[PDB]
Amino acid sequence: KVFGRCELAAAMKRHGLDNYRGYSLGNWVCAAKFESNFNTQATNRNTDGSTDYGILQINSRWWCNDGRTPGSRNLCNIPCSALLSSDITASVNCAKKIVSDGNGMNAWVAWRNRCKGTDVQAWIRGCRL
Ligand SMILES: [Cl-]
Numbered sequence: 001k002v003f004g005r006c007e008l009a010a011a012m013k014r015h016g017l018d019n020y021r022g023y024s025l026g027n028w029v030c031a032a033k034f035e036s037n038f039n040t041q042a043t044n045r046n047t048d049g050s051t052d053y054g055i056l057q058i059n060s061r062w063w064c065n066d067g068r069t070p071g072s073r074n075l076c077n078i079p080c081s082a083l084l085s086s087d088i089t090a091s092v093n094c095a096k097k098i099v100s101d102g103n104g105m106n107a108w109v110a111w112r113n114r115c116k117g118t119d120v121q122a123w124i125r126g127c128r129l
Contacts, residue, residue: 001086003038003055005029006127008088013129015092021099025129026120027111028095032056033123034110040091041084054083054091056108063094 003011009029012018018025035057036042044052050061050069060069064080076094083091098107105111 001040003032003040005033005038005123006129008032008038008055009124009127010129011088012092015089017092017095020096021104023099023105024120026123027105027115029123030115030118030120031105031108031111034114035108040086040088043084051080053080054085055088056083056091056095057110058083058091058094058098063098 009025012028013025017028032038032055036055038055040055042054042057044057046052046059046061048061050059050072051066052059053064053066058064058076058080060066060080061072063074063076064078064083065074066080076097078090078094083094099105101107105116
């Protein structure tokens with residue numbers, strides 16, 4: 001599923017991401033835009049052999065099991081394929097664990113490089129929330 005910008009914002013809000021650990025909703029929408037272009041089916045392979053999955057590009061090195069990243073962890077206790085669903089519940093629940101691990105949203109490279117320190121509220125502007 002390719003979400004619309006406001007559609008995703010409302011889904012994220014419903015799942016408890018607005019101001020989760022101090023990160024306003026705009027931060028999450030901006031991250032999803034630059035990580036996956038709002039596409040739940042996005043995958044990208046990393047140099048170390050791990051793969052990033054889904055709308056928030058969660059990495060199989062630490063967070064999910066894809067059966068092909070030897071010596072990796074599965075801290076979210078889920079198959080990586082679950083992160084590709086049109087239902088974003090699994091991605092959100094795992095993202096909540098990631099953002100709580102001490103490094104905040106800096107875990108997401110595109111957030112650090114393209115959202116951090118910008119006017120992120122622009123990403124939810126005009127949305128019925
Ligand atoms: Cl933080």
